[PDB]
From a paper:
Viral replication requires a 3C-like cysteine protease (3CLpro) which processes the 200 kDa viral polyprotein into six functional proteins. The 3C-like protease (3CLpro) was named because of its similarity to the picornavirus 3C protease. It is a cysteine protease which shows a typical chymotrypsin-like fold containing two domains: a β-barrel domain and a β-sheet domain separated by a groove where the active site is located. The active site is characterised by a catalytic dyad (Cys139-His30) or triad (Cys139-His30-Glu54) and shows a strong preference for a –D/E-F/Y-X-L-Q-G-P- (X can be H, Q, or E) sequence corresponding to the subsites S5-S4-S3-S2-S1-S1′-S2′. The key role of norovirus 3CLpro in the processing of the polyprotein and the absence of homologues in the human host make it an excellent target for antiviral drug discovery.
Two non-covalently bound fragments were identified in the active site of the protease named as J01 and J02, as indicated by their omit maps. J01 binds in the S1 subsite where its carboxyl group is oriented towards S2 and S3. J01 forms several direct hydrogen bonds with the side chains of Gln110 and Arg112 and makes some additional hydrogen bonds mediated by a water molecule. These residues are at the tip of the functionally important β-hairpin (connecting strands β9 and β10) that is involved in substrate recognition and moves substantially upon binding of polypeptide substrate analogues. However, in the presence of J01, the β-hairpin adopts the same conformation as the ligand-free SV3CP, suggesting that binding of this fragment does not alter its conformation. Since the carboxyl group of J01 appears to hold the β-hairpin loop (residues 109 to 112) in the closed conformation, this must help to prevent the enzyme from adopting the 'open' conformation that can accommodate the substrate. The benzoic acid moiety of J01 makes many hydrophobic interactions with the active site residues including Pro136, Cys139 and Ala160. In kinetic assays both J01 and J02 showed inhibitory activity against SV3CP with Ki values of 0.37 mM and 0.34 mM, respectively. Since J01 and J02 bind in the active site cleft and maintain the closed conformation of the hairpin, they are good candidates for developing further inhibitors and linking them into a new compound could also improve the bioactivity. A superposition of their binding modes on that of the covalently bound Michael acceptor inhibitor demonstrates how these two fragments occupy the S1 and S2 subsites, respectively.
Author numbering:
A (entry chain B): 4 to 173
B (entry chain A): 1 to 172
Amino acid sequence: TLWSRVTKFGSGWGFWVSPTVFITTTHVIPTSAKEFFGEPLTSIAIHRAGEFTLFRFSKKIRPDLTGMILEEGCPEGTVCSVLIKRDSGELLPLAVRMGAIASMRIQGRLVHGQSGMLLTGANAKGMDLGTIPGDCGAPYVYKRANDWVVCGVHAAATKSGNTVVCAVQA
Amino acid sequence: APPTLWSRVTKFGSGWGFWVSPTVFITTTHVIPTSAKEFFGEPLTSIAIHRAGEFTLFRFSKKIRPDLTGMILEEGCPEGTVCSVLIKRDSGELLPLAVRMGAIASMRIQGRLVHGQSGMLLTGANAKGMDLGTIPGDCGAPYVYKRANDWVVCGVHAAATKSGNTVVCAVQ
Ligand SMILES: Cc1ccc(CNc2cccc(C(=O)O)c2)s1
């Protein structure tokens, strides 16, 4: 299942692309650490691009997994799924219609990534129909031919929880 | 979704059912074991059954779930209502799948004739597979939504298209 790749990390979540590759949102990462998942920070490559961070481990941390396709966002009009895990034990896949890459003003801060709008729309008044701040690092995925593609990580949302930003690679 | 609603979702037959109150249990007709003569330690003779197609309601002559309060059961919901389908999956994983509800429909789904309130999943481009969509084992899971200040149950999961986003909620 895709869902066993979504992992609690720092102040949010991350996603196992492969046995050695983990992606997350830069702001959720601990600022004090000597190891992650039992490997010394000494042995980990860190590639940061604004709110997107990729970790490459020097041994197989998740040898139960196959490697997946990671791409720099997706075409406009693609309906992605954001794979949200909650501390409650809920799994909440939500449909997101994707638009252009932009630098957007979101609750008083500038965030660069792929814009999206949830298909739940109008509102939520309902934590099960929108994102909350704790959800940052959740992956954006879609099916293409036979394959799941991951195309970024949850970086920010407006107060409704219904306009979102997907941070992307490079 | 609140813990008091997940606590009402009970493994039953080939799927699930749902406690509306201490004495009322609803489910999808085809998940009921056809040989069964006893439910929650009560003989069939002491149970009132109300059945309409894929919707079945059991009413007991004593309190089976006294920890619960009675809640509101309605005959489906207004067109445009966004519901959550409360699906339990392998390992205390809880999957509240978001569905936009539409018209009362009759459909042919994988060859079987089904009737109830139709809806479209809001989980992805299409919901094929178990990560974004429903499976036969989910049948009898409740459709719920929050009003004003409270939660309503308006039916039970009866069927879904294999390659698609369309579900059917059986209704009272
Ligand atoms: C073999 C399949 C994999 C997934 C299927 C679609 N879901 C679904 C849910 C609930 C009842 C039904 C039904 O066809 O009764 C289908 S069908």
